[PDB]
Design a protein around this ligand. Structure first.
Ligand SMILES: CC(=O)N1CCc2cc(S(=O)(=O)N3CCN(c4cc(C(F)(F)F)cc(Cl)n4)CC3)ccc21
Ligand SMILES: [Mn+2]
Ligand SMILES: [Mn+2]
Length: 243
């Protein structure tokens, strides 16, 4: 089986999500044929030289999955688009493009983060075009770390003071790649949408964000599974209910 996760939005202020991800990496992920992380692994990223200890803890845990024989892949999200080759080397992850076509046990599957499908949010698309401009990225990454931190903290507060996908963009993407299956995240609306692409039925599978519990897509030769699970091992106990 091949696993897909996304939108964990890991951050030191949310240690429960981190604990749930580490348990996932130590258990479920060790049995997979491959693990794909479709963006927004971290709530924020300002460059691979960031000494944030969470980054090294996550890198080491993913690297242990890679060392256990499970190749791990990463497509950038809108939050962590600055994840680069240094962190890829530290984690053992392979960085992929914003769109990839996979062959999963015979079925062709398109994967992406999903933010490029929200073509109706012109405000976000302007921000995305800005921070994806290569000379702007190089200029920001050259700034001192403490300056990048203050910029990011202010820009996050400015944003606090998610649009769904455009149906035709979905069709266009699935017909550009000639697939009947699409997996993405970003929208935080886990679902399986049926549609038509290339004159045949097609399905758009959406991952969930790790807010209260975990979420993953498991692809087997026989089916596609959208699975919700708790962060930690909920040890069962009994309460003496009465008839
Ligand atoms: C919609 C959405 O995705 N948002 C909204 C706010 C936000 C904040 C983050 S951030 O905190 O992780 N971080 C902020 C600073 N940033 C910059 C800043 C610059 C510039 F300052 F020079 F312009 C250039 C570049 Cl290349 N990167 C890197 C990322 C991530 C995603 C989002
Ligand atoms: Mn997200
Ligand atoms: Mn996103």
């Amino acid at each position: 089986a091949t696993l897909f996760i996304a939108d964990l939005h890991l951050q030191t202020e949310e240690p429960a999500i981190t604990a749930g991800f580490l348990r996932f990496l130590q258990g479920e992920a060790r049995q997979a044929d491959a693990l794909y992380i479709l963006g927004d692994l971290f709530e924020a990223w300002i460059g691979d030289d960031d000494p944030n200890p969470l980054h090294q803890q996550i890198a080491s845990a993913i690297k242990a999955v890679v060392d256990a024989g499970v190749p791990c892949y990463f497509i950038h999200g809108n939050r962590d688009f600055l994840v680069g080759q240094r962190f890829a080397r530290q984690s053992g992850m392979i960085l992929l493009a914003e769109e990839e076509r996979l062959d999963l046990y015979g079925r062709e599957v398109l994967i992406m983060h999903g933010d490029t499908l929200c073509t109706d949010d012109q405000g976000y698309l302007a921000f995305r075009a800005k921070v994806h401009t290569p000379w702007i990225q190089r200029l920001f990454l050259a700034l001192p770390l403490f300056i990048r931190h203050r910029i990011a903290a202010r820009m996050r507060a400015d944003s606090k003071a998610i649009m769904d996908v455009n149906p035709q963009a979905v069709v266009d993407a699935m017909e550009r790649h000639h697939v009947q299956w699409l997996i993405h995240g970003h929208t935080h609306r886990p679902a399986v949408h049926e549609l038509q692409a290339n004159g045949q039925p097609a399905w758009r599978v959406v991952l969930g964000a790790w807010h209260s519990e975990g979420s993953m897509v498991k692809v087997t030769p026989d089916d596609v599974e959208l699975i919700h699970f708790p962060f930690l091992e909920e040890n069962l106990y009994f309460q003496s209910h009465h008839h």
